[PDB]
Structure formats: structure tokens, C-alpha cells
């Protein structure tokens, strides 16, 4: 056995400790003040006029913009296909829960925070009909949580979760107001703040494994607990650009114009006010200042600093931030030109869209578990062994180019005489599974007249 | 900090030329040591809080009885021993630029070298008591039994050595031998000059050195068993037990502070302040020997055995001493060194006034003698902690 | 033969020793602090503001990003095997195991560790019904382990693995919380810590060989044990660029602007405060500073450093990194021309695409041998000798220029009158073996009408 009370505190420790690491990563996407960003040449009273830099915001958005599911695809149990079987099939069951939970919205936020902090967690839980009444009580509730609110310990010998804690703060963020512990056979919640606990609301569940799945961003088998997408490579150029921008901004307040000197001419002879050390000048156009001079008196000036000198460094540093992140060059305004042909886009895009496709591959492994868990909760017993072989189906991450896809697809289909069957032409034009299932009805309504 | 620190491994003179393309593999390396104790002692499981071992001690009995003669009453009795694990540890420290480059495979080498050092410290503590921690319940050298072996190994082991064990009712189960003893297992001839322990044409190792059996008993060879005149051990290694609480627990830090001095004379350094990296290593071991007198110390040629006798401040009475099988006349609790020497030669034994030697006063009597010495305190009327032990070789 | 409890320690020493070698390559894929990266000109207090350089990670991703297995090929004396769903062609049984294990995910991670460190290990076992909750219990558990968790001694006479150990560190990375040792005929595991905290579980298996296969990055036969993809040339240009980028950043913090000077007026003549060596100049625009300059004074300034003088050195290092890695110039320089046409994209990708196809060729032999070994472990009998002729099939590494491929495939098929049979047109479009069976069904369901 393990004591739930000791375990509640043990996991509150590991969680509330681990928040200190991930605070460093958030500071790049929220553009919080980092000490290292602050440009050293700026005078000390002026150091408060910070320059913030947006490469990490741009990069995590440019990926999370491009991820969505078209649906789920599951092996044929027996016979040729499930595909024309419609609302009775197992693929449309899993898509029904996805729509009913609005995971089409909040999975996009879960993907985003998995790229910020390196992990997010999917919780599966049948709804309690006594709370949160905006739900279908026939459908398992699925909730995605950030690592700022859910924490889970993976056993490294397997890769399963051992136990996990979800804890939620008061509106000012100063105090935990409720905590929930998930265990392999039960879930428990304590309903008030840590100095003021009360006996837990507790439920069994039949899954015999913890009903939480870690979505984790990873690049290697070696990244065993996931990794922030905002790499140290990209942090360094984010902070370097801030140091340049502050030093250039200070220069524009202090040196972008010449400083004018006069030597040899005595302050009393200039008539300078002896108490204040200064004299007024009208200085409108074509006034000539006539001086008594003598003693070798003359005027000379310190030059301006060229702000171009700093700009040459920023142009070079953008060319670094592009190549490190793998964004297209137009995203960082640095290209010699726009694209000018249908595939000249695909060239510039190709470095990003292959990355987005691997994020789809790696998060597919989370959702294809989340739906096995949700099935086993709703139905009980063994999962139909086809489900171990499902694949999630994702939007093609590149920009849509419908007019260039069109004259290709029609040349392959050739009014039914052609190389490909009709429905592969629909897949090729990029129509989503959920859309082809309505479009096959419209085809029958048309073929009714011919 | 300066190059060639005695503490910090920092891109030092020791690594001279490591960057070059011509530095070879070491062709003259040696095998790392492995503990004999961990091969021969049974590994009992234990946690950090240690264990208690129960032992029976009731001399329970029954009597021959007549018709209607009423039956006698008896009861059993029991005791227990505590065992606790000791802890052994070290830290080794390198400059960040050292650990980034890992010249001469230093860190990978050093991890094995501290592992061998921990293992060897445990082995030495179990055999010889050298630096042994207070938690270890005795060590193998404390045995009051010794035996010469060089003249002929079979006679030394199987006859004389065994006699000293079975006369005290102990079994014989193994021999541990230092591999320096090979020239004595070689030779050991019959009267015709053939060696006892090898084949007619002398092609192959004498069978003990194959990890064979001397008579019935397996033998364990090793290259680090001998200290002083003691070259090996024979006994029942079922009488010894040990345990380990966890693995060699290597971890690494670079933010910590270390002290290079003692706590009373400290010389603190932050590892971050000068950009070092440090690896800390620790392990825990338990060790118990049920009876240290169950073993016989094999020794190369005939030698004296030396003892310390403590009277625990006893204020009155008489004791007695026994050497091998023989027993002295009664000895007063406060007798002089010349007095107790005279009581030893009066034992009726082959010992003589030029062999036996003594030093002490009213207590703490050190004595050296060519045999197994032991004491009877039955007539001592005070100081029940009074005791005798082997103290050192020489 | 050796007593296994002796053998595990002998292996764990060799495994522990290995970590310090492979940690060298790790420090380029993560941009760790490398002492050779630190630019020498910046003063000892500014040395903390490390630059990091992204070329090695850019390269090792840009290879692994392109790789994907699409299925298996097995020949037979029948001349063809019918496509026939999930088992009747034996290649479809192998692909069924390739999805019941998520090897479509774990391979695209595993190749990244196999490129970084130079090796990764494919492990085969039958699943444990007491522990493996989330697998079909009748398929073999085939899984990939990185060289940070598995080590195998390979005999130089035969290139067979003699024995191998898989050792898992705890959540803190310190203690080995379990070890699994694979012998030619047996698998053994110690389950709680170093075999200190448990006795071993065991299982015999029906093989002559250790059930572990090395994926190894071999450039030439002489890489007898395989080698890191982060080549000495890429390490060289990466560290060279890191130094020049730091020296430029330090220049912008100290010296991108003139330093102004006056001579011929003692501090007392300026009204400088004696305790602090300064006076508060009235810094606003268009003031004129008047001095007595009583020695015969003059004004001078040291020049700013030209930051262009670092920048047109960084140009050459990016152009070196392009030539050494063989990445398309557009991956590293924004000033290189974006290709205008599909032919120009085949030109620019060619240097990379060929190298990806080498990694496909070389890693295919590892997976191919892993499947043959899985077949013996599941079915117990000897392998049908056709499996020795089996081969892998992989994704076309090049970008999908669909509108160019469609007009070409349409021209060759010409509504059945043309050169190619229908099936060759489907492979020339790059449709997977998995999609080809959907094509079969959707074509029959169209030819049902005509």
C-alpha cells in the first residue's frame, strides 16, 4: 500500500519545486525581463527603458498555427474497409468525443504549451452529472492541462505514469486552493487551501492505470521527460538582439547628432550668466554668431555615431535567427524577394513544414493513447485489438494552393478514364475526412439526375 | 586557481601533451582488484536501520524417571545481536575545462578507481581491521589460532591447521590464499622429491591454483590477502555475513561549497566561484562475524602470537590462563609481569623462559607466546568486563 | 562461460566508461557551454554572455526529418504476392507489428540518436502480461533504446553482438534503478536497484543470437562500430562561428560608438567635483559647450569599430557550413537565391537528398535484420528463406512537387492507351504501400458502376 496523505504532500513538493525550472522558459515567450537582455552601454538611470525581442514568440506560434487533426483512421476489423460505414464505425466514435469536448480548440492550446514548457498532460475522466452541466453525460470528459497546473511522475523502467497531481491556484496566484491526486485505481480531491484541508471527495476507476497521458515535445530517445522547443540556440540570439537594440536605442538618445564645442573664448566675454553657467540663443536660420575670439579661440565638434553601424549587426543577427529557428526568411523580413511561382513557396516553406509534420507524428502518439484510455473507461473490459494500430490523421501543414492542386487532380482523374479513383482525388485536393463523409452524400444527390 | 593544485584536477602537468595524435593505449595496465569478502561471505539483505539476529540459548533437558516419580519442570532461553551498516565516502573535483575535454579518459578512469578503492577499503576493514568502522562486529585477524605452512602445505593445512579447528569443535569450509604462496604449494614434496599437488609430467597448474579443492574444501585465490606474516585463512566462512544498503551512489554538482581544510581549520571554496565540477560517491556496508576464533591464520613460517589482557579495574580475586590445551596454577588479579610470566612457564608445556615475554602493570598485561592463549575469570570477584584479545602481529 | 551476476558488473563498467565519450557529440546537438566556443577578445566579466551556434542541430535534424519507412518487400516463386490486407502477403504481417508497436514514432526519434551518437539499439522481446498493459499480447515487443541506456559488445571476427546490457538510471539520473542483460539464449533483469534490491527475473528465448540489433551510422566499412554524424568539420566551423559572434557582441557592448576626449583644460577648470571626477553636462540637443581651454586645448575621439568588419567574416563561415554539410544554401543564408521552379528545387535539394537516401540504405539493414529476428522469436520455427531477400521501402526524401508529377504521370498513362500500367503510375506519384490497398478498393467500387 501507499498512504494518500503522505503522497499528496510528496507530489505537491515535486510539482511546486519543478515550477522554478520552467519559469526560465516562459520568460522568452511572454518577453519578461531577463537580466542578460540588458544592453551594457546604456547609462544606469536609462536601463529601465528595455527593448524586448520576439523570435521565441514567432517560432512557437509558427508551429502551433499549423497543427490540427482531420480525424482518426483505424484498421479494418474484417472485410475490405470501415470507411463508407459512417456513424457506426470506430473512427467516427472517437471523432464524436473529440468534437463534443471541443478538443479542436483546446488541443491547439495544449500543443502550444507542450512547445513552450516541453510537456502538457491529457486527463481522461467520466463527467460528474452534479457539476459543469454544459456537457453530454454520455461522453468521457477529456481535459488538457499545462505543467503549471498538473504534474506526473513517469516510472523510467517502464514509461508509464506512477501517480500524478493536479493543483489549482486562487485568482491572484498566491495560494493553492484545491489539489487532486490520481492513482492507478482511484482519483481523490481536497477542496480548500493547504492550511485549511478537508476530507477528500474520492472515486474508484476501473482502468488499472493512471488516467493521465503526458503530451511531451522530444527530439531524441534521450529526451526522456521532454524538452522546451525554445532551444538555448534560439535564446542566445533573442538576448543578443535585445542587447543590440538597447545600445542602439541609447545611442539614438545620446550620440546620433554632433556635439558642438568652442574653445579659447572666455565665459565672461560670451556673457554667460555666472550663477547658471548658460546663455540663451535665438538660433533661427541664417543668424551668424560673431565672437570676440582671441587667444587661438575656435569651434570644433565631436561627430555623430552612425546608427548604421548597429543596424549592420541586426541584419546579420536576423540572418542567424532565421537559420537557427528554420522559419522561412520572409517571416523575419530578411528575404531579397517574395516568392514568384507556385512551387517557389514550397521551397521556402520546406524547412518548416517537415518540422511541423514531426510534431504531428510525436503528438499523434499521445492522442492515440488518450483515445484507448477513453474507450476503456466508457466501455470497460479489453479494447478491440484493432485500436492498438490506429493512426491520427492531420491537416497537410503547408499553405493551401488550391489553384495549382486543381489542374493536377483533374489531369489525373480525367472524368473517370484517368489514373486514380475519385476518392483518392478527394484526398489529394486535401478535403478532410469529416468533409468527404458529407461530400459523398452530395455526390449521390447529383448522380440521382446525372 | 593555480595549476598543480593537490585537490583540483585543472588542465595540469599530469595531462602533458594529451591533445597530440600519437599518445598510445596503456600497454602496461593492471586488472582492478575485487573483494574476497564479497565472493566468500553470504550476502544478507538489510536496510539503513540495520537488522537484529535472534539466537537460541536454552539448554532444555529431560530426566530419566521411575514409576510414579513426578516429572521435572524446564524452560528455554533466547538472545539477539544487533547489526548496523557503516558508511564510506569520497569526493573528487575537476576544473570545468578538464571535465569538458576529459583528457586521458580521466573521469571514466577515476569512477573505476574510486570504485576499486571503496571495495578494497571494505575488504581490508573485514580482514585486518585497518581503519574499520565502529559498526563492524569484529574482523578476521582477531583469531587466536595460527599455523605455519612453508615446510609442507598438505601437513600445514590438512593435519596441523585442521587439528586447531576441530579441537575447538569448528568446521573447515574454505581456504583463502594470497597468490604469493604459489612457491609453497609448488615444492611441498614427498620424500622422493615429487610435489604433492601436480601431475606426473608437471605441465599444468597445481590444482589449488585452478581454484580446485584442498582435500574436501574449495579454495579462493587473490593478490591482496597477505599482511605481515599472515598469508591466508582457513575456516568456516558460513560464520561471516555482510550486506550493502544501495549501489555506489555517484552524483555531480557545481554550485556547492567545499572545505579543503578540517572543520576547525576550514578553507572554503565555492565550486561555482572558480568554475569547478565535483563528483561525490558513497556506499553503506554491514558486516558481522559470529566467532572470530573460528578461523585459523595461515602464516608462512613459525611465529609468536601476541595478546592484550584487560582486568576491567577488578578490585579482587584470582584468574587462570590456558595455553593450547594446558592450564596454569591460580593467578592473583594484581600479579607482577615477572609473576604472570612464571605462571605461564608453570603450565606444563614446551614453552621456556627465553620464549615467553610480558609487559604491563596491575592490568593491561601485554603478552607474546608461541600458541593459542585464553583466560578463565571464574575466581575474579569484580570487573566482569575483564577480557583478552589478539592485539597486533609482532 | 561466465556466471551472469559477474558478467553484469563487467558490462556496467564498460557502459559507464562509454558515457564520457558520447557526451562529446551531445554538446553540439544541445548548444552546451564549450570552452573552445568562447570568443577571446571580450573581457573576463563579459565571458558569461555565451553565443550559441545552430549548425550541428540544423544538420542532424535536416537529415532525420526526411526519413520514413513505408513498408517491406519480400519476393516469392509465385512472381507476385497479392496485396491482400493485413497478413496474407508476409510483408503485411511485418507492417502489422510495425504499427502494434508505434515504430512509426520510435524510429523517427531513434534515427536522431543514431545520427548524434553514431548508434542506437533495436530490442526484441515477447510482451510481459503482468507489466505490458498497453500492447496486443500476441505481437512481439520491438523497441528502440539509445546508447545512453544500452551497450552491446560486438565481436570483431563476426560483427555479432556477444552480449548486451540495458541500464536505466533513476529520475535524478544517479543510481541504476534496473539492469537487463541479454545473453544468446536468455533475457535476465534485476528490478529495483543494481540487483541489490531484487533477485533477477529470467526468460529463455528460441534464438542463436542476442535479441538486440545495432542501428549504426557507418560512413565506410572502416567505421567498424559506427560514428557520430556531427563531423569534425561541422564542429570546427560551429566553434569558429561561436567565437566571431561573441567578439562582435562584445564590440557592440563597448565600442560600436566613438569615445570622446578633450586635452588642455585641468579638471578644476571644468568645475569637475573632486570626489567623483565628473560634472553633469546639460545633455539636451543643440547646446554648445564653451570652455576657456587655457593650455591651448583641443578635442579628439577614438573611432567606433566597424561592425561590418566582423559581419563579412561571418558570411564566409556560413558559406563554409553550407558546403561541408551539403544543406541547400537556403537553409543557412537568407542572401542565397530562392529557387523559382521545380527543376531548380531538384537542383538545390540534390546534395542533401542523396545523403538521406544513404541513411535509408544503411539503417534499412538494421530494421530488416530486426524483423527476421522477430519472426524467429514469435513463430519458433526456422525463417522461410525468402526473408533473406527482403528489403525496406522508404519515403522519397525530396519535396513533393505534385503539380509537376501529375502532368508527367497523366502523360505516361494516357487513359490506359499510354506507356505505363496503372500500378506504376501510382508508385511514380509516391503513394505508400498502405495507401495502395485503399486505391484497390476505391477502384473496384468505381468500376462497379463504370
Amino acid at each position: 500500500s501507499i498512504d494518500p496523505e503522505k503522497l499528496r504532500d510528496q507530489l505537491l513538493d515535486a510539482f511546486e519545486n519543478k515550477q522554478n525550472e520552467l519559469k526560465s522558459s516562459k520568460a522568452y515567450y511572454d518577453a519578461e525581463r531577463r537580466p542578460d537582455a540588458i544592453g551594457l552601454a546604456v547609462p544606469l538611470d536609462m536601463r529601465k527603458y528595455l527593448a524586448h525581442v520576439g523570435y521565441p514568440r514567432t517560432y512557437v506560434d509558427a508551429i502551433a498555427e499549423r497543427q490540427e487533426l482531420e480525424g482518426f483512421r483505424i484498421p479494418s476489423a474484417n472485410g475490405e474497409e470501415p470507411e463508407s460505414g459512417g456513424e457506426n464505425d470506430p473512427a467516427s466514435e472517437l471523432w464524436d468525443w473529440w468534437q463534443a469536448n471541443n478538443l479542436d480548440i483546446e488541443a491547439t492550446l495544449g500543443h502550444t504549451d507542450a512547445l513552450i514548457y516541453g510537456t502538457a498532460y491529457i486527463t481522461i475522466s467520466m463527467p460528474d452529472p452534479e457539476v459543469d452541466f454544459d456537457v453530454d453525460p454520455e461522453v468521457p470528459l477529456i481535459r488538457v492541462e499545462p505543467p503549471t497546473a498538473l504534474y506526473a511522475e513517469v516510472d523510467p523502467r517502464t514509461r508509464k505514469v506512477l501517480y500524478a497531481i493536479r493543483a489549482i491556484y486562487g485568482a491572484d496566484g498566491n495560494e493553492i486552493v484545491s489539489a487532486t491526486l490520481y492513482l492507478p485505481d482511484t482519483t481523490m480531491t481536497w477542496l480548500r487551501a493547504e492550511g485549511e484541508w478537508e476530507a477528500p471527495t474520492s472515486t474508484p476507476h476501473g482502468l488499472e492505470m493512471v488516467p493521465v497521458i503526458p503530451i511531451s515535445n522530444r527530439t531524441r530517445l534521450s529526451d526522456l521527460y521532454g524538452t522546451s522547443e525554445i532551444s538555448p540556440e534560439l535564446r542566445s540570439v533573442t538576448d543578443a538582439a535585445a542587447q543590440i537594440l538597447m545600445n542602439m536605442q541609447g545611442t539614438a538618445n545620446l550620440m546620433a547628432i554632433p556635439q558642438r564645442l568652442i574653445f579659447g573664448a572666455k565665459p565672461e566675454e560670451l556673457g554667460i550668466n555666472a550663477e547658471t553657467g548658460q546663455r540663451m540663443f535665438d538660433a533661427y536660420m541664417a543668424r551668424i554668431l560673431a565672437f570676440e575670439g582671441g587667444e587661438g579661440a575656435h569651434a570644433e565638434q565631436f561627430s555623430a555615431a552612425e546608427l548604421r553601424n548597429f543596424v549592420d549587426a541586426l541584419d546579420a543577427l536576423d540572418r542567424k535567427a532565421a537559420s537557427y529557428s528554420g522559419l522561412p526568411p520572409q517571416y523575419l523580413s530578411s528575404s531579397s524577394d517574395n516568392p514568384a511561382s507556385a512551387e517557389a513557396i514550397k521551397a521556402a516553406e520546406s524547412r518548416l513544414v517537415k518540422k511541423v509534420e514531426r510534431k504531428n507524428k510525436i503528438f499523434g502518439g499521445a492522442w492515440e493513447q488518450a483515445m484507448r484510455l477513453a474507450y476503456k473507461m466508457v466501455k470497460g473490459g479489453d479494447i478491440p485489438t484493432e485500436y492498438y494500430r490506429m493512426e491520427t490523421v492531420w491537416r497537410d501543414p503547408s499553405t493551401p494552393t488550391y489553384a495549382a492542386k486543381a489542374d493536377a487532380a483533374a489531369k489525373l482523374f480525367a472524368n473517370g478514364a484517368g489514373l486514380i479513383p475519385r476518392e483518392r482525388g478527394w484526398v489529394d485536393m486535401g478535403y478532410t475526412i469529416v468533409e468527404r463523409e458529407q461530400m459523398r452524400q452530395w455526390l449521390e444527390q447529383d448522380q440521382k439526375q446525372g | 586557481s593555480a595549476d598543480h593544485s593537490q585537490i583540483a584536477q585543472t588542465k595540469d602537468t599530469m595531462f602533458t601533451g594529451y591533445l597530440d595524435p600519437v599518445q598510445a593505449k596503456d600497454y602496461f595496465a593492471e586488472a582492478e582488484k575485487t573483494s574476497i569478502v564479497q565472493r566468500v561471505a553470504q550476502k544478507i539483505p538489510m536496510g539503513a536501520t540495520g537488522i537484529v539476529i535472534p539466537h537460541w540459548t536454552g539448554d532444555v533437558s529431560a530426566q530419566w524417571i521411575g514409576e510414579g516419580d513426578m516429572k521435572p519442570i524446564t524452560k528455554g532461553n533466547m538472545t539477539k545481536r544487533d547489526v548496523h551498516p557503516a558508511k564510506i565516502a569520497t569526493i573528487f573535483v575537476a576544473s570545468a575545462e578538464t571535465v569538458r575535454a576529459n583528457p586521458a579518459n580521466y573521469l571514466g578512469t577515476m569512477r573505476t578507481k574510486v570504485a576499486t578503492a571503496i571495495a578494497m577499503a571494505f575488504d581490508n576493514a573485514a580482514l585486518h581491521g585497518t581503519n574499520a568502522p565502529s559498526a563492524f562486529q569484529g574482523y578476521l585477524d582477531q583469531s587466536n589460532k595460527t599455523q605455519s605452512i612453508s615446510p609442507n602445505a598438505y601437513q600445514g593445512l590438512g593435519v596441523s591447521g585442521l587439528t586447531k579447528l576441530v579441537t575447538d569443535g569448528k568446521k573447515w569450509t574454505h581456504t583463502l590464499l594470497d597468490d604469493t604462496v604459489e612457491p609453497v604449494l609448488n615444492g611441498s614434496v614427498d620424500a622422493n622429491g615429487r610435489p604433492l599437488f601436480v601431475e606426473s609430467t608437471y605441465e599444468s597448474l597445481t590444482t589449488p591454483f585452478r581454484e580446485g579443492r584442498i582435500l574436501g574444501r574449495p579454495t579462493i585465490l587473490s593478490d591482496h590477502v597477505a599482511e605481515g606474516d599472515v598469508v591466508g585463512y582457513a575456516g568456516d566462512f558460513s560464520q561471516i555475513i555482510w550486506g550493502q544498503v544501495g549501489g555506489l551512489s555517484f552524483d555531480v554538482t557545481d554550485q556547492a561549497t567545499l572545505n579543503l581544510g578540517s572543520q576547525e581549520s576550514p578553507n572554503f571554496v565555492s565550486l561555482w566561484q572558480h568554475n569547478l565540477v565535483a563528483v561525490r560517491v558513497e556506499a553503506e556496508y554491514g558486516l558481522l562475524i559470529n566467532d572470530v576464533n573460528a578461523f585459523v591464520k595461515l602464516t608462512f613460517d613459525p611465529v609468536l602470537t601476541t595478546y592484550a589482557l584487560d582486568l576491567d579495574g577488578a578490585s579482587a580475586g584470582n584468574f587462570t590462563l590456558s595455553l593450547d590445551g594446558k592450564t596454569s596454577a591460580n593467578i592473583a588479579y594484581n600479579a607482577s609481569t615477572a609473576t604472570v610470566k612464571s605462571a605461564i612457564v608453570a603450565i606444563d608445556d614446551g614453552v621456556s623462559a627465553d620464549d615467553v615475554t610480558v609487559t604491563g602493570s596491575a592490568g593491561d598485561y601485554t603478552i607474546t607466546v608461541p600458541g593459542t592463549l585464553t583466560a578463565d575469570f571464574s575466581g575474579l570477584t569484580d570487573g566482569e568486563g575483564a577480557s583478552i584479545s589478539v592485539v597486533s602481529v609482532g
Side-chain angles (χ1 to χ4, degrees), chain A, chain B:
Chain A
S1 59
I2 300 291
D3 169 28
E5 185 78 288
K6 188 275 302 194
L7 184 56
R8 183 189 54 53
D9 288 318
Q10 179 188 339
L11 286 165
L12 283 172
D13 292 349
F15 169 43
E16 197 150 49
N17 178 42
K18 185 54 53 72
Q19 285 189 40
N20 291 310
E21 282 68 24
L22 62 73
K23 271 175 164 67
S24 66
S25 71
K26 198 199 70 153
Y28 286 91
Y29 187 88
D30 278 356
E32 302 190 326
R33 174 186 167 280
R34 287 90 61 215
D36 313 57
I38 303 184
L40 299 189
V42 174
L44 275 67
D45 63 318
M46 195 180 298
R47 292 283 183 88
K48 60 173 171 281
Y49 305 141
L50 294 177
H52 298 311
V53 173
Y55 309 134
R57 175 67 69 108
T58 297
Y59 181 49
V60 175
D61 281 11
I63 296 173
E65 274 171 17
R66 295 181 176 287
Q67 302 196 269
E68 67 189 38
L69 281 72
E70 300 185 359
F72 289 76
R73 175 167 48 67
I74 305 180
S76 186
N78 251 224
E80 310 319 300
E81 305 177 82
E83 291 286 303
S84 59
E87 73 305 303
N88 270 261
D89 86 351
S92 61
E93 169 186 70
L94 299 183
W95 189 255
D96 199 49
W97 303 343
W98 176 279
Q99 289 185 153
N101 282 280
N102 278 120
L103 287 178
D104 61 326
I105 303 177
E106 294 206 315
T108 310
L109 306 186
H111 301 321
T112 304
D113 292 33
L115 298 164
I116 306 291
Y117 313 115
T119 291
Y121 306 91
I122 304 159
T123 303
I124 300 95
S125 54
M126 187 72 78
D128 174 3
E130 305 186 46
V131 74
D132 196 14
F133 311 97
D134 182 29
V135 299
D136 182 357
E138 184 60 11
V139 171
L141 202 76
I142 301 177
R143 290 303 308 144
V144 62
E145 299 280 43
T148 66
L150 175 40
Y151 178 75
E153 287 290 358
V154 298
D155 160 38
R157 290 127 72 249
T158 68
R159 301 193 308 237
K160 297 295 188 294
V161 174
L162 286 164
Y163 30 52
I165 194 166
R166 198 281 297 286
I168 188 68
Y169 291 78
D172 301 87
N174 69 302
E175 68 196 60
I176 288 178
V177 296
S178 177
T180 294
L181 174 68
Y182 311 99
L183 304 180
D185 62 335
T186 181
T187 296
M188 307 173 69
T189 300
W190 300 257
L191 294 165
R192 187 170 172 157
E194 307 179 276
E196 305 189 321
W197 296 127
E198 60 186 310
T201 180
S202 176
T203 182
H205 68 76
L207 291 88
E208 301 302 336
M209 62 181 71
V210 191
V212 70
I213 300 300
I215 301 158
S216 57
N217 183 54
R218 57 178 76 190
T219 64
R220 291 174 295 209
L221 300 175
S222 300
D223 304 331
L224 187 60
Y225 202 72
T227 284
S228 175
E229 188 52 38
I230 302 163
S231 166
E233 305 146 73
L234 186 59
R235 294 178 200 178
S236 76
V237 301
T238 302
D239 299 333
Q243 292 184 8
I244 303 302
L245 284 164
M246 286 194 73
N247 296 349
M248 192 275 284
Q249 190 68 19
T251 304
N253 286 319
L254 295 168
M255 283 206 180
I257 64 179
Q259 177 62 297
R260 291 174 173 178
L261 323 173
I262 298 185
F263 292 114
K266 295 286 169 160
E268 302 97 303
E269 191 157 27
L270 270 55
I272 292 180
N273 171 277
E275 196 264 319
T276 60
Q278 64 204 263
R279 192 197 199 291
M280 265 51 70
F281 40 84
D282 60 342
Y284 311 136
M285 294 174 203
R287 264 61 168 158
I288 300 164
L289 263 290
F291 291 117
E292 293 86 341
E295 306 184 28
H298 60 281
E300 66 182 2
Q301 62 179 46
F302 300 120
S303 78
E306 284 205 331
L307 301 186
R308 292 184 181 168
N309 196 24
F310 290 102
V311 172
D312 294 333
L314 288 173
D315 285 352
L317 187 57
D318 284 337
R319 288 164 174 65
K320 244 53 47 173
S323 302
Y324 290 9
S325 61
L327 297 168
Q330 182 68 306
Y331 275 46
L332 308 187
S333 68
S334 295
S335 189
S336 300
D337 62 0
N338 48 274
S341 188
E343 75 280 66
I345 290 182
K346 210 75 69 188
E349 199 65 22
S350 63
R351 182 163 165 36
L352 175 59
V353 287
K354 205 65 56 175
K355 187 179 293 283
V356 184
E357 200 284 332
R358 283 179 69 254
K359 304 313 187 181
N360 298 347
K361 202 85 81 199
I362 274 58
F363 301 161
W367 291 106
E368 296 158 22
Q369 281 192 299
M371 299 312 183
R372 277 179 271 169
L373 274 288
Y375 185 98
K376 189 167 187 177
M377 178 179 288
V378 173
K379 303 299 178 71
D382 296 348
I383 308 180
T385 188
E386 313 93 277
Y387 282 55
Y388 296 114
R389 282 162 278 212
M390 72 171 73
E391 289 173 353
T392 43
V393 182
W394 296 78
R395 172 70 71 172
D396 57 318
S398 78
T399 54
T401 188
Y402 187 93
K405 286 300 309 188
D407 74 10
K411 287 276 285 287
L412 293 184
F413 181 57
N415 310 332
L419 182 69
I420 54 95
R422 169 175 271 129
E423 193 144 342
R424 190 66 181 72
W426 295 351
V427 170
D428 184 58
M429 286 296 293
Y431 305 120
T432 65
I433 294 164
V434 186
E435 214 290 325
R436 298 194 309 267
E437 292 314 314
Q438 59 176 27
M439 186 159 50
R440 218 178 304 99
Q441 318 309 321
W442 298 342
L443 181 68
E444 292 178 14
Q445 290 203 339
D446 210 7
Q447 296 286 112
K448 203 66 56 179
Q449 292 74 239
Chain B
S1 53
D3 291 10
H4 200 266
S5 179
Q6 174 55 8
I7 303 299
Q9 192 76 42
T10 182
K11 301 294 299 190
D12 192 357
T13 56
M14 195 198 80
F15 302 126
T16 290
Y18 83 90
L19 179 62
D20 84 38
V22 71
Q23 184 176 259
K25 192 192 76 177
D26 183 356
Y27 301 116
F28 311 122
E30 283 287 10
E32 291 299 331
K33 311 309 185 197
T34 185
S35 316
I36 55 161
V37 69
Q38 299 178 242
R39 290 181 64 195
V40 306
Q42 60 178 320
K43 189 181 183 183
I44 58 146
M46 67 171 65
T49 66
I51 66 159
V52 289
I53 291 164
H55 198 290
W56 184 266
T57 191
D59 190 4
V60 177
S61 70
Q63 303 298 348
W64 299 99
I65 278 290
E67 166 69 311
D69 203 17
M70 281 291 119
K71 294 78 167 178
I73 299 182
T74 65
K75 83 176 189 84
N77 197 357
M78 304 184 74
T79 58
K80 65 183 186 291
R81 289 178 163 279
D82 303 9
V83 183
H84 296 286
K87 183 164 59 193
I88 178 162
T90 198
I91 300 185
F92 61 95
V93 184
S95 176
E97 297 196 3
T98 304
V99 58
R100 292 321 303 194
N102 56 255
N105 190 23
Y106 184 86
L107 286 92
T109 303
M110 192 66 176
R111 290 168 84 92
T112 70
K113 288 286 189 286
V114 299
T116 294
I118 288 168
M120 284 298 295
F122 174 36
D123 201 88
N124 286 342
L127 301 182
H128 310 308
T130 56
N131 314 303
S134 307
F136 284 15
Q137 295 274 24
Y139 62 94
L140 206 71
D141 264 9
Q142 294 183 274
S143 173
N144 68 1
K145 301 177 184 290
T146 49
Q147 180 54 51
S148 177
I149 197 169
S150 177
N152 176 306
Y154 172 89
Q155 289 289 354
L157 293 168
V159 183
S160 300
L162 179 59
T163 300
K164 299 193 183 194
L165 299 178
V166 305
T167 299
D168 196 40
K170 273 76 166 185
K171 304 95 176 178
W172 172 29
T173 314
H174 307 81
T175 52
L176 276 288
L177 296 177
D178 193 279
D179 75 4
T180 55
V181 86
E182 199 181 356
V184 161
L185 274 290
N186 300 341
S188 280
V189 296
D190 65 25
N192 300 319
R194 318 304 282 249
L196 292 172
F197 290 104
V198 54
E199 298 159 29
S200 190
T201 49
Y202 312 105
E203 293 164 42
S204 187
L205 294 163
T206 51
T207 73
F209 277 75
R210 307 184 205 183
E211 294 184 321
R213 301 173 162 77
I214 298 280
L215 292 156
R217 287 81 180 183
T219 190
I220 292 95
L221 280 292
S222 276
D223 63 341
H224 59 276
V225 186
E227 282 201 23
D229 300 321
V230 175
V231 74
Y233 304 86
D236 54 336
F237 294 78
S238 62
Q239 302 298 342
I240 71 169
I241 75 180
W242 72 289
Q244 171 172 249
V245 187
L248 303 183
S249 295
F250 294 89
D251 76 2
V252 55
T253 70
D254 56 18
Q255 306 306 296
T257 293
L258 298 186
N259 177 20
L260 309 191
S262 85
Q263 307 95 295
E264 310 79 10
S265 59
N267 179 14
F268 295 106
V269 164
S270 159
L271 296 177
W272 170 232
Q273 175 192 3
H274 313 313
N275 197 16
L276 293 306
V277 174
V279 178
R280 170 269 297 254
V281 192
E282 65 201 322
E284 301 180 55
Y285 294 104
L287 191 293
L288 162 68
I289 301 190
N290 177 44
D291 183 356
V292 298
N293 292 319
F295 298 88
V296 60
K297 288 144 66 174
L298 307 180
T299 179
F300 206 75
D301 66 341
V303 282
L304 284 68
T305 309
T306 301
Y307 304 88
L309 170 69
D310 178 6
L311 277 296
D312 191 34
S315 61
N318 74 99
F319 67 100
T320 283
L321 295 177
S322 172
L323 180 67
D324 302 336
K326 296 283 188 173
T327 306
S328 73
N330 300 74
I331 310 181
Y333 79 104
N334 66 349
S336 83
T337 58
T339 306
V340 307
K341 176 167 173 165
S342 78
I344 292 292
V345 297
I347 282 176
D348 172 38
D349 193 12
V351 304
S352 59
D354 51 336
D355 285 343
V356 186
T357 297
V358 184
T359 284
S361 184
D364 45 281
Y365 302 97
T366 66
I367 179 165
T368 188
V369 64
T372 292
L373 184 66
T374 193
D376 171 14
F377 305 118
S378 306
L380 195 70
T381 69
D382 195 10
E384 188 53 31
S387 187
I388 183 169
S389 180
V390 177
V391 64
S392 70
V393 179

